[PDB]
Amino acid sequence: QVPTRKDYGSKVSLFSHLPQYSRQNSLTQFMSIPSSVIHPAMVRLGLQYSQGLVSGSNARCIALLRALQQVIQDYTTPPNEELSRDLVNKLKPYMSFLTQCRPLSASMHNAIKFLNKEITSVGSSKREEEAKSELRAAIDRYVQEKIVLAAQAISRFAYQKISNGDVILVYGCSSLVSRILQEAWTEGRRFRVVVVDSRPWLEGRHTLRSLVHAGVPASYLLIPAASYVLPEVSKVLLGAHALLANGSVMSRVGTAQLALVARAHNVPVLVCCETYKFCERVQTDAFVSNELDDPDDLQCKRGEHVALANWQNHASLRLLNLVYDVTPPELVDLVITELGMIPCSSVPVVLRVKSS
Amino acid sequence: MEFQAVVMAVLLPVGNKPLIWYPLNLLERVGFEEVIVVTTRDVQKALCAEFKMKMKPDIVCIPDDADMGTADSLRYIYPKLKTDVLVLSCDLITDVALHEVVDLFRAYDASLAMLMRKGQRDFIGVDSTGKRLLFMANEADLDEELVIKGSILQKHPRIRFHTGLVDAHLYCLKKYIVDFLMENGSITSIRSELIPYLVRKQFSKSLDIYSFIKEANTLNLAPYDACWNACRGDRWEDLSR
Amino acid sequence: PMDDKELIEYFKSQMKEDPDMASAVAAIRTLLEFLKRDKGETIQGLRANLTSAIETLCGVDSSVAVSSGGELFLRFISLASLEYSDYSKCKKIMIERGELFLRRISLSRNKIADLCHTFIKDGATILTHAYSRVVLRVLEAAVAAKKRFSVYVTESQPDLSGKKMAKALCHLNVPVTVVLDAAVGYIMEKADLVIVGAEGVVENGGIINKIGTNQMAVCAKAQNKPFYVVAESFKFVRLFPLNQQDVPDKFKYKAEEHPWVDYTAPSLITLLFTDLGVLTPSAVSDELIKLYL
Amino acid sequence: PPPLQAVLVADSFDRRFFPISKDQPRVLLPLANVALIDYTLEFLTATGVQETFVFCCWKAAQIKEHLLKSKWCRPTSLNVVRIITSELYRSLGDVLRDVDAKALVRSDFLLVYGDVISNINITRALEEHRLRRKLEKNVSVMTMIFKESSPSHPTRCHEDNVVVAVDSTTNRVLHFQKTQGLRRFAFPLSLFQGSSDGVEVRYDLLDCHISICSPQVAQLFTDNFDYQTRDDFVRGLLVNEEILGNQIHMHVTAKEYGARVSNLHMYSAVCADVIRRWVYPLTPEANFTDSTTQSCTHSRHNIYRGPEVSLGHGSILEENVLLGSGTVIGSNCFITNSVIGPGCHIGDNVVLDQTYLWQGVRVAAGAQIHQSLLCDNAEVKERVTLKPRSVLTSQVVVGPNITLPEGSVISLHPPDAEEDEDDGEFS
Amino acid sequence: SELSERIESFVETLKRGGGPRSSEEMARETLGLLRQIITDHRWSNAGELMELIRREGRRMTAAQPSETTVGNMVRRVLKIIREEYGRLHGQESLHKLLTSDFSFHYAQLQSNIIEAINELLVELEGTMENIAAQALEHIHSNEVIMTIGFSRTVEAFLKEAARKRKFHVIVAECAPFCQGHEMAVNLSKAGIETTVMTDAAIFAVMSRVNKVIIGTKTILANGALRAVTGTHTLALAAKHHSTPLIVCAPMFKLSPQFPNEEDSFHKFVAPEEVLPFTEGDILEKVSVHCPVFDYVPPELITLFISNIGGNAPSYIYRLMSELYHPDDHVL
């Protein structure tokens, strides 16, 4: 069977319960080239998750659903068995392998739950081809109505808040924020955008390039200097990787800071997220549940010397590369979803109306 | 199946063990329950009988014509190909971890993944990361100067060139490459005029060509000196293998 | 059809005949009377005429409660038309449901008073901002329960509604003191709780009220005093003001710079007393989310 | 150990700034209210140069007069500027031939033009050059300085674009060629076979036009009388490798700025970079040339204001705006990404975008000026609109009721100016 | 002319790039230059000496406004001159208002000025030792400390505290100039069990940090701080979690200026640190700003540790009165 990925380096004592891997170490060096235990599509998907070729939560969910459609297409029911259970039992090891390649996101968890419910509801007296076609159609409908139409509705809703001659501060890279800003600029709103970035990913350059190509006037700076630009900032628009049942917003590592600093400068905070990213779990800190990225990514060249080059030699030295933080509900003013403009405390309510 | 292994013989049973055995063992180590082999017919269309005396899990053998190239062999065996192919040759004595080339194929959804080793005439040029190759040509086609398109340097402003590298003739090829070969009978040899065409077709939904550079072993070429070097190296190589 | 003029004088006479009835209730009654005699044939035309009438009424009165009642009436029409496709059956259903809705919103004030009066203790001090009929009713209910308490009321400088509130309280034999609009921060330490009305409850749970409400709420929060708001259900409106500037201009003015309205965030509010019961602010959004599918 | 010298060519022997060069030398043009010669001298002084030779031929009188009353000609300056002038100079080859004839350079001097804006420290490059010359026993001759860049940057002009083929092991240049009006680039096969240890073709390099040279450069220039430019020397050396090898190497900088202004596009790009602090510490508010008239205060969004500006009521300075001392701005104006010289006067409701107004320029109310250049003492009358790429040179007055086309260079000299005039565009 | 060339070299070094990396070296160089100015220059009266010192101080401060240690030393020397002149010759308060002169010559004033400068230098030498000595009163066993950037005073503090206690240190790199890596390596070489993180993680982990110890570049008149960029967010997070914020700053980093003064407060450097030059055409349309200093209000600071002990920000004004004359603020 598939082995277990080896932990890399030494972890922080407070994060010792989380797995920490390295990008150089690949899990496919111990698996047969014509993969049998793991479907080849899942192998490719895990390879490009571990190497970082798919980063955004929406992109990760779409890639997972595409590979999963391929797996369903290639799937053939074994003799003397039922599809509604065999399919789930076969899919579980693929999900375990994907988690080993890189910890799953909230969108991927919700998509997996949705497909498990869809497969479980497949009748036992229907043809295999019909069941496969229905599963593919359900995946397509899920993708459409949970990403495309949701983004369109969120852009339409956010067009109202964006006014002429105001300043909007965005953080990191998210497709929803970029689409909102581009559509608002297209409809005739005139405004500036301030892009805040953070090491080591430096993914704010993606949205910077998108805004420049769209014609929107843009400014760029790192996150420590955020307190310098908030005096002239009118709104802080953020994207969320997940909304928790207690209202807390799980997002990129710097996001919470911005909200806090925004509260210090009396600047409204808007968070745009799709309702399928709403999670019924709750957490109050970035310690109980998080993901440790490759520590070697923290190395930077300042001049001709790299200070953290051989950081393994120092026994008492540790490096952590967090990828998520949790924002308390009291630092967030708006949540913009396809349902509408809701307070940060209405997250469970939506979770109640989307389950029945 | 993800891959279909194809072995070329257009062949040598010489050595401590048959020269064709080593590629077969390399394929056998990493999965590959079955493998298709094209057997020589110019010298003797009976090497299938000789291979029937070997020890392998499963082999399918197909006799070839008198004279035919690698592309011609693929054209002959088209009906038996169903997915992406992994083309090898009898002359390949390597200890490379095959997961590198196939991992390059898997990760980037490449149309071609190939393996080469540092030498110990043909110019190749890869980008900064050293994985994707941007240029490839031979001294026969170039009169005195090497010409690079402006678009290539516009997209990739840093091309690093190798000259002495040795092609190992191990290719992971996508299925539509085979289909394009089938629609066009002009191409006769994979190395000579198939791979360069794909390389130049990148810059003209886009073709992706990737290469992996090794530093341990090459294949036993047709020269007798190459055979002697392979025989010398296989004594230490065959210990673990 | 009912003329624009006829609608305006119907609204004004409805207000005048019953001074104790809120503007939103009169607007809803006027809309129901307009629907009663319409002579239309299609539900498509009915909605256009109804929203035009709501626009006219909002032109007459710029209060937030009028617009909230108009939106509630439009949602009522949509909900009724959802069940019945035939226009005549839908018309009868809308008429009878409107009568029932009118009687319910009439009983709303007494329901709020009965739910709310228990929070007032004996010997406590009440701080109120301006003239609200709901706070007057809850103080009546507290007095009827043989509770003894004192009330401070601000003057509401633009129109001295606090003096009218003090006169009405004196008619009830309640010790009431009129204090300046600038002395709330001086009086907050003596009061035990703050009870104020609302002209509209926004999506997140904040309130839209008289210009002096926000500073009173901030002062109450600074001294950790409870801040209670009494409001009817037909004052729920799907607006989310980011700040004071984000409030629509049609509610601030025409009711150097003198806005008649401010916005109070839900974080400064302890509990809301509606005919739906005693709610946290976070409940309000839920109701709205339940109303629009 | 020997003092670091530098040869400063204060004459651009080409003519790319005509007709602006007909009145003022290009070296004395104000980039951000500071002459380019001042920027080059500051660059030389900051990098450790102790002796500088200034070779000027065209309009040498103005250059000498400006230099003598400058900071670097003071006795307290650590850079001993020596102005050498001659009327027979026609090319950089002539300058280096004269350098060899006078034996001015001792060893390892700096070759750079008089219009180079940079903040590059050449300590590492000089150390590498000296180490190569010591280990290889006098084989390395020149070390060019290049800046890592992207081909799509505004600073990378088509005219001065270049592609090289080098050895990544030793940073040795093996092929070098411009890419003006070319779609395909050809590299001779000789360089591959001569060195099979790995050759890399680089197109992501911006030419800073800075060279760490040797007296052997002057010897080769005086041995080859046909050399006229540095590119000719480089090409002739690279092609003639079989005899007298004389390898030339390169150095790449990434965290430092370096560029050479050679036309109006380069002028605009470098001015925009300087305003936005890309050439730090060389900043308009740094006052690196200690003159009282260039004192400035820096504000948010790179708004540099000089003394006694007195901005009008309702006018807006958006970003990247430099105002000279004494400049007067009207009411309800709109200035953006523009540089205004000292003493300028602007009327009401004027709009300026990406313009450059030299000292003494007077603009009447209602003007709309975009992406143009207005030389010193120019004048614009009411309700006049200038399209992008317009140029007014040396006191041209443009009358009312006229909109100039995009490419409109006008001056007081009839032939060079496209439409010479002093009262408008209608003849 | 040796003094003139020394002054010119000092001004050029201030303008281009910091030669003396440590602030103590800058203070010592300024004090030595001022001593040479006092000795070599010929002056009869005290007023002309004061105006000369004011002139060179104005030049040096105009060379680099962000480097406030030069101005602090100039003002300290001016107050020393005032005190010595008052002693050899013969404080705005209500007492002075209710209760109730230069251009005189004294031959022995110069020796008193020189010895006062010398004892000031002697005090300057041992500031870090005093701060390290009092470090042990603020660190308890198994504590968690957080630091931003690289400061020699804080590292001396932690290394002295680590000889008798075991504690964990979390260093947040100060992007773009990621100098927190160097401090983390230095502390790890002393076995202090350190951790390296980015700025973005600060608020993420402040909930598990017991106290924050930081350095500073300048302490203003009201107790505010001019620190490295990212310190304001750090102080805001500490205030949110109520963790004490300790500032280990010597007395020469104490400047009598006030926050709102010409807005020439932050220092802006080349945007190459934030956005590289290889991005391409987008750099034409993008405004990149790279401040290196940040303003921290005095209400976010819990304690001030200096060579004279521990103090509250509310007392900082008094330390202003004992160090600088009210007429030397403008300089």
XYZ file of N, CA, C and O in Angstrom, chain A residues 158-166 168 180-192 215-217:
104
model
N -21.485 43.233 -4.023
C -20.395 44.106 -3.608
C -20.313 45.374 -4.442
O -19.646 46.327 -4.026
N -20.958 45.403 -5.611
C -20.979 46.634 -6.394
C -21.626 47.785 -5.630
O -21.280 48.949 -5.855
N -22.565 47.484 -4.729
C -23.254 48.544 -3.997
C -22.322 49.263 -3.027
O -22.347 50.496 -2.938
N -21.504 48.514 -2.283
C -20.612 49.139 -1.310
C -19.539 49.984 -1.981
O -19.192 51.061 -1.481
N -18.996 49.520 -3.103
C -17.920 50.249 -3.760
C -18.485 51.530 -4.357
O -19.420 51.498 -5.165
N -17.918 52.664 -3.960
C -18.360 53.974 -4.408
C -17.230 54.670 -5.154
O -16.122 54.145 -5.287
N -17.524 55.867 -5.648
C -16.560 56.616 -6.440
C -15.550 57.319 -5.544
O -15.911 57.944 -4.544
N -14.275 57.213 -5.913
C -13.233 57.945 -5.224
C -12.839 57.413 -3.867
O -12.274 58.160 -3.064
N -13.112 56.146 -3.580
C -12.723 55.545 -2.314
C -11.517 54.630 -2.506
O -11.110 54.318 -3.627
N -9.699 50.961 -1.427
C -9.977 49.599 -0.992
C -8.652 48.879 -0.798
O -7.786 48.915 -1.679
N -14.424 40.749 -8.192
C -15.261 41.831 -7.680
C -14.704 43.179 -8.111
O -15.432 44.037 -8.626
N -13.400 43.382 -7.913
C -12.796 44.665 -8.257
C -12.854 44.923 -9.758
O -13.165 46.040 -10.190
N -12.562 43.903 -10.568
C -12.586 44.079 -12.016
C -13.989 44.408 -12.512
O -14.165 45.308 -13.341
N -15.000 43.693 -12.014
C -16.369 43.968 -12.432
C -16.824 45.344 -11.969
O -17.511 46.055 -12.712
N -16.452 45.743 -10.750
C -16.814 47.072 -10.271
C -16.179 48.157 -11.128
O -16.818 49.171 -11.434
N -14.918 47.966 -11.521
C -14.270 48.928 -12.405
C -14.943 48.961 -13.771
O -15.080 50.029 -14.379
N -15.364 47.797 -14.272
C -15.997 47.740 -15.587
C -17.315 48.505 -15.607
O -17.603 49.234 -16.565
N -18.122 48.371 -14.553
C -19.435 49.007 -14.530
C -19.366 50.523 -14.405
O -20.397 51.183 -14.563
N -18.195 51.089 -14.126
C -18.032 52.532 -14.091
C -17.569 53.104 -12.768
O -17.444 54.332 -12.660
N -17.310 52.294 -11.745
C -16.783 52.826 -10.497
C -15.325 53.234 -10.669
O -14.545 52.548 -11.334
N -14.960 54.361 -10.066
C -13.594 54.864 -10.095
C -13.041 54.843 -8.677
O -13.603 55.478 -7.780
N -11.942 54.120 -8.482
C -11.385 53.927 -7.151
C -9.940 53.472 -7.278
O -9.468 53.126 -8.363
N -9.242 53.480 -6.146
C -7.904 52.925 -6.031
C -7.954 51.629 -5.236
O -8.862 51.402 -4.432
N -6.654 47.763 -15.698
C -6.652 49.208 -15.762
C -6.916 49.917 -14.452
O -6.961 51.153 -14.436
N -7.091 49.184 -13.362
C -7.377 49.801 -12.065
C -6.083 50.380 -11.498
O -5.049 49.695 -11.517
N -6.090 51.617 -11.001
C -4.908 52.134 -10.298
C -4.653 51.330 -9.032
O -5.567 51.087 -8.242
